[PDB]
């Protein structure tokens, strides 16, 4: 086998079809089903799989009990078989920790795990299931990183690391990885002022992260990286249509290299794919809360700050939970290009659910078309009732 | 590995022995059994297993109330191995759907899902485990298709599609596939009035299909699909023998190109083996419900309208609930000849036991012998009063 | 791969080590294991599995009342890894009926399972996990067969089949398969009055079964088979050491080509290794009840009609319920020997335990050594209080 | 594939890095999770796998009820894989038996199981899932192994065994094993004066074992085997850090060739890694009890009376019940060095904890880094009231 080569565009996208859904908060209603948060998808040569980080129990399980708690001893990113249920028989765990990402490069499969306190967090990578390298906290701040699929280009994965304050400025770190180990690493640069869990897809050699200001932005700063020469630049979506959550209303004009002010310390992980005029961003549809998704076709919505939408699509209605979202790309499919995908989380449990005193998550996963396809909406579809 | 190729005819079928059972509601009554309906059976050059809609819930979870309705964002197209139980932990997801076809061409199984609201709903397909094409609706009006397996010839796969009213005139085409690349489509042709959910079978490089008119005929629908030339006609079974439900008596003379009048706007998906002297019709014994099972001998049934029985084999006794049936193949067991199999729904739940609130069902499957065995009878064996 | 053959002898018994144990009844207390009986073990050329005849439910589920029933249409023939619990998520089902054997060929594995009414049965053959022969019953009552593997010998497979009555003359026959196919059958000839439930290994070209005389004696059957002539003898154990059960006391003198009388219309299924000096039988503990179960080197028991024995070893207390027992070896072992094995069904519930309303089972096994090892026994372990 | 050998030494150890973590008490709470103590973790060519051994029952099943049982007919060895937790249905069992070693040759995997009455026992040893030799009892005072993994060079595998009292003179030997075959045994050498339960490790054509004496001593017993020669010694670890548990306060001159006095009659299974100035011991925090658990680097602590820690790392916290702690590697990463490893077992039920009627336990496993990592602590994490 051989390590995969960015050499393909993205398909032209006119909608959206249904890709993947596991139901997992109905079934685990009365199976043993893990509860889990932070979910992403991630392809090998062979197969597609769901990602996850589990909260080292069943939902069920009375030890479900407070698992709106985010870092843990007994937290693990597991993968499982794609639309099935995160299941304790049915889970393989990849590493430890409570924030994660994984790529395959073609060869071998990376995952990187971190874990421990606040001030004395610490990663370690994974290659072909077995511990490589490891990464000491280098800001003593809860150090963390992408929560969804890395990209990997002849043998090269870029991971973007943070290490600070997630209300402020911080410490972002772009590393190169190959084959688990350390190639290089470098500060962040360019005009993006504050980063947090990336979403990355890879195209024609070049590999485009699309990231969460938890500081001062509504809009989504984005990195784009050169795997050859290990070399990145940043800035914002200069877009008015603003996809973070939660967020102001749309203004006329957007902001290209700073942060759209209105909303101050909070966030929600999010993607795009960025692609001239074939460009599509997600987003929750409510500006308040993680209620709702939908993409919207905004053409040059990274270079252009007068760009609005000329065609969407409903992923999730209003009236529905969602959550984190990311992309992620079959890179062995066969064609002449890459299709675009993506995961949205739909959170159910806490904070927004306090009946019961559990957090989880399913997922529902979409992938692009070239026809122009019908659209309908997914929910989580559990009832909070029978969890009573 | 090569394309499957159709060289074969049917062996000699002198009496139905017992393939599959997978006991699915007795076994669901304490374990994680997923609800499903719709089942099939479709065999890979190494494999055979079950297929099915699964409910995305378990049967003895309380989301299993009010699964008797038909299309829901919760529903997949689940496999696991032939005559074990559909659970949670051994299920496969194929696609994500409430409505589906699979088959094998030699080297890869192409899987097709419909999903959407009844107006905007569309076809996703899929060819080794990835998604390569979609269709959209062309009628608005519940996109469907044939719930149980297609049937491939040199790579080519042909699948019969609806789209429009249930009770009068639809549009039918017929997709024909290619590493599930559309490389046709045609309207339908013929003299049959209305088309549902086909059961289709190989031989000698002609591809057959037994359909349900929902309509207005209770003799039911022919297509016979040549896949090298990629056309078709259509025509009714011609016998007297009718094999719909509900349905009237058997009369004295059938019809040949036009339905057998009495019962509107329901049936049943079917099946039959078409093969000269060879031919053997299933139905269900009761003309009013659902209940019980036969397979009768009728010589020409396909082509002579005063055909009427001489042999039998009773599969499911009157007392027990049946449901859909539909025929599958080996194409890939050793022998001259291919073996005629078929698969029996057993509807347990809604509408007919309302004492539970769910739908479900397990499955029966039969395969061909050249000897005259004896003949036993197949119910689903699960005790309601349990489930209470 | 290839055709096995029998080239290699016994290897000299001198004790017998702990090869298997799936404490199935008491894990199946808060699992889902499957209600089983008339296990036995069976290997391919890569792994050995447990065998048993399911009932289509789990212990806890309610279905698994009124499991003392024999014969029904939730049965079939099912596999599991060794010493793990026969459960519904780990087990592969072979075919659908409820008498069964199986047996690898060094290529592939023919699984033979009967199915239908008692007057109606009828046999189907599976190799390499396709149905390919079928067989009828002959005598209307009750086509069985013998509960534990079959041997192959150059792709030839013997099996033995009764049909009529379990209590006075009945048609025996011994089936010849290869690659699932009938090269030949024959009526049983011989001295023996009565077979059922054949166990049978082999050594040096040729296959010896020990069998149970269901209508008169208390002495067992013996058929001796040539499968590359594939001809037959048989006769009964000479020795006065009686093994069957129930029985008389020992005597002094036992019978070689009649039934020793005393005990009429019973028996259990058991086995025999008959090596000249290195024989050694099983049998139950107690002569009235399937309690207990013992291993007794008993020199020339086949022909020696004065013979006793002069070493054993207990493997089940006379206090712990004991069951059906046979014979399996691993014909694909390193060594220039075969080593003997035997499997203990250890029966638990009805008749003997009436405060349970089921009847299942789970499964000790036993391999030669060559050391002299100290004994232990091994009963289920399970305690029916906590199931009520 | 290959014989595995010794070629490389360990890694610098600067700190250790998280490995695995079941969490199979919280999982278990809600799931059929299998009862089981002494764990350890060994390494295949392609993949490394949690080892236990099992009680024969779940934690919530009735049967667990007196787990804090040590030997009886209802345990096996089994394995399942890295960091899930071990259930009925994940679980592969090796052999059976109440103590247990095993390791990989490079080509296959040996595994020894030790079962019988505390007078009569006897060991088979597994190679390729296949029972290969057999040693009776010698002593007949329950004849036990390592309750860790062998290690293996050139296709020898050296394991050590004790026969005879547990507190007071016993009969310890060496035994080679090259692909289950017995090549030589001896009787234990050196100054050692009690050996139990053996650690072992592997680097450059020498074998480290790390033992338990249970007689006298609270500095650790060691044996050096060179399995080329197939000779070893045995002294004690002469650093006054003493490493036993419970255990007096360390002292300022520890004892190379005796036991050091104070504590009689108990002990606690563990390891260490000794290599010169990368020397790291392990030991539970508390000198009375199972609880807590810690690393110390103490330079030559193997040879030097006089030394003492000079850095050191926290696994578990002194608050949380600890248990047996083992070695072992990876002896098929990448790489010129082998990284050291080890594994905690998290006892909990009785005795400590009686509210509770059994006795289980999770694990957790670190694994060496050449990078100076922060520290965290991991508890197993149940909560006893959730199983009241
Ligand atoms: C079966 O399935 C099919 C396939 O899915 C269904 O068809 C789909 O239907 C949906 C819903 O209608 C469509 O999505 C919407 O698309 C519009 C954009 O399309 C319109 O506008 C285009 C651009 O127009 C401008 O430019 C052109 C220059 O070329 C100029 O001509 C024009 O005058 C104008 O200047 C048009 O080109 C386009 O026409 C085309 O499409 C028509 C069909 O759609 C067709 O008839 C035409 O012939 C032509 O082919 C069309 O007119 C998006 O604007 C819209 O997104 C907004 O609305 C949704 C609510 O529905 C909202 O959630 C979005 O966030 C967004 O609204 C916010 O953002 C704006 C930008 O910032 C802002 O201005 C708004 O005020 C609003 O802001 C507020 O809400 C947000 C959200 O909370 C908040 O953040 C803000 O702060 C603020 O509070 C939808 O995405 C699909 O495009 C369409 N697909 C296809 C293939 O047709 C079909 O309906 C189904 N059938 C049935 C029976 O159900
Ligand atoms: C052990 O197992 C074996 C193997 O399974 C068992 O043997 C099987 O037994 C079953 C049950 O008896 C048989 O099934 C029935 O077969 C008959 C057909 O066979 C008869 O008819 C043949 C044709 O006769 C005509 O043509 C010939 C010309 O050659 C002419 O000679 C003759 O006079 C007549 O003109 C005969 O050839 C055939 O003889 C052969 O077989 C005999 C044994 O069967 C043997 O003794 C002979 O020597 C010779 O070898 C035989 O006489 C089917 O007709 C029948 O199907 C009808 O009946 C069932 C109810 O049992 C019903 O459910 C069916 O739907 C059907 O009845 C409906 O359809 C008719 C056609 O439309 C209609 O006219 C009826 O009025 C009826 O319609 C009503 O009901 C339906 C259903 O709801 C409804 O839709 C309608 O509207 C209306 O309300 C059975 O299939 C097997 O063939 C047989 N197998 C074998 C290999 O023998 C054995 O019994 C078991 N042993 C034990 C101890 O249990
Ligand atoms: C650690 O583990 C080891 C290894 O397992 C344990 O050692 C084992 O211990 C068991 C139990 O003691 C032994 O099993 C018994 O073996 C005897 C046979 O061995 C004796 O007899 C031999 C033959 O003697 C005759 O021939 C020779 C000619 O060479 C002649 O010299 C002699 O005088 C006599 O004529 C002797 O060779 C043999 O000696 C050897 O072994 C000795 C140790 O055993 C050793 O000390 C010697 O130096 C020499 O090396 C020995 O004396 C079996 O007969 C016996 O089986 C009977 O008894 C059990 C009950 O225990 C019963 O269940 C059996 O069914 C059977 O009894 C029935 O059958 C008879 C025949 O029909 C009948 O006559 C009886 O009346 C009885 O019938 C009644 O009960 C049955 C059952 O319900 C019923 O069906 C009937 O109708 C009727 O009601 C045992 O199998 C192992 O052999 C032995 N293994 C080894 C390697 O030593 C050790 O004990 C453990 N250690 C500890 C501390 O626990
Ligand atoms: C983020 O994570 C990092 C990485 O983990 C954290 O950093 C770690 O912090 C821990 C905890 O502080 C450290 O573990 C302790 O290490 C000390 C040893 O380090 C000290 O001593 C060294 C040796 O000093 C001697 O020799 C040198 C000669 O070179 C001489 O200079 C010196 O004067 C003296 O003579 C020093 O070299 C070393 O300095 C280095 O490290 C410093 C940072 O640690 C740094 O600042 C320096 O510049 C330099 O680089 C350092 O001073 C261990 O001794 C200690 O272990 C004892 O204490 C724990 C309790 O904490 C106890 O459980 C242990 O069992 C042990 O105590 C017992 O054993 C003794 C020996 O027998 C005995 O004498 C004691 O009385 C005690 O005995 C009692 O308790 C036991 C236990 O029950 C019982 O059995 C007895 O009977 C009796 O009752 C710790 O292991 C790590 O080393 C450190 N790692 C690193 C890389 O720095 C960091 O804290 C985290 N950050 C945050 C914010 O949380
Ligand atoms: C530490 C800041 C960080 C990103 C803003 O908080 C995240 C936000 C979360 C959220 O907004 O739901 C949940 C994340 N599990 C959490 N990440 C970590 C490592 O705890
Ligand atoms: C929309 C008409 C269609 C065929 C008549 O209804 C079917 C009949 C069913 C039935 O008769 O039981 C159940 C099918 N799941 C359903 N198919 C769909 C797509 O809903
Ligand atoms: C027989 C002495 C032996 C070592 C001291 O006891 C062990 C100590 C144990 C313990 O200290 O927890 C549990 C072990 N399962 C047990 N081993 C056996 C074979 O029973
Ligand atoms: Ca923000
Ligand atoms: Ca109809
Ligand atoms: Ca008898
Ligand atoms: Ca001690």
Same mark, same amino acid.
């Not at 979910?39 to 062979?46: E, G, I, L, Q, T």
């Not at 993968?79 to 924030?99: D, F, H």
């Not at 603003?242 to 957007?254: A, E, S, V």
């Not at 989380?345 to 998550?361: A, C, F, H, M, Q």
């Given at each position: ?114 874990? !421990? ?27 963390? &990183? ?21 209300? !402020?400025?911080?410490? &972002? ?57 290990? &070399? ?81 699509? &409903? ?7 969602? !959550? ?24 159910? !449990? ?39």
């Amino acid at each position: 086998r051989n390590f995969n080569n960015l050499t393909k565009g993205l398909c032209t996208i006119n909608s959206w079809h249904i890709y993947g859904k596991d139901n997992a908060v109905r079934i685990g209603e009365s199976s043993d089903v893990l509860v889990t948060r932070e979910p992403y998808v991630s392809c090998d040569p062979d197969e597609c799989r769901f990602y996850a980080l589990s909260q080292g129990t069943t939902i069920r399980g009375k030890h479900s009990n407070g698992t709106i708690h985010d870092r843990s001893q007994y937290r693990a990113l597991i993968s499982w078989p794609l639309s099935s249920p995160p299941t304790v028989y049915n889970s393989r765990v990849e590493c430890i920790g409570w924030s994660s990402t994984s790529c395959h490069d073609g060869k071998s499969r990376m995952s990187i795990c971190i874990s !421990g306190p606040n001030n004395n967090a610490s990663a370690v990578v994974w290659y072909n299931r077995r511990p490589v390298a490891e990464i000491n906290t280098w800001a003593r701040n809860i150090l963390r &990183t992408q929560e969804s699929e890395c990209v990997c280009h002849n043998g090269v994965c870029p991971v973007v690391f943070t290490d600070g304050s997630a209300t !402020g400025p911080a410490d &972002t770190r772009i590393y190169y990885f190959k084959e688990g180990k350390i190639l290089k690493w470098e500060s962040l640069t360019g005009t993006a002022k504050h980063i947090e869990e990336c979403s990355c897809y890879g195209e024609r050699t070049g590999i485009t992260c699309t990231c969460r200001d938890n500081w001062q932005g509504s809009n989504r700063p984005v990195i784009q990286i050169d795997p050859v020469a290990m &070399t990145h630049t940043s800035q914002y979506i200069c877009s008015p249509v603003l996809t973070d959550n939660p967020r102001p209303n749309d203004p006329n004009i957007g902001k290209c290299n700073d942060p759209y002010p209105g909303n101050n310390n909070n966030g929600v992980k999010g993607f795009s794919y960025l692609d001239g005029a074939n460009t599509w961003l997600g987003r929750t549809i409510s500006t308040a809360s993680r209620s709702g998704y939908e993409m919207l076709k905004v053409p040059n919505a990274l270079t252009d700050d007068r760009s609005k939408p000329i065609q969407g699509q &409903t992923i999730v209605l209003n009236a529905d939970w969602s !959550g984190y979202s990311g992309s992620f790309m079959d890179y062995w499919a066969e064609g002449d290009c890459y299709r675009a995908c993506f995961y949205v989380e739909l959170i159910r !449990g806490r904070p927004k659910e306090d009946k019961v005193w559990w957090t989880s998550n399913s997922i529902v996963s979409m992938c692009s078309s070239t026809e122009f396809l019908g659209q309908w909406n997914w929910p989580d579809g559990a009832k909070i009732e029978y969890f009573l």
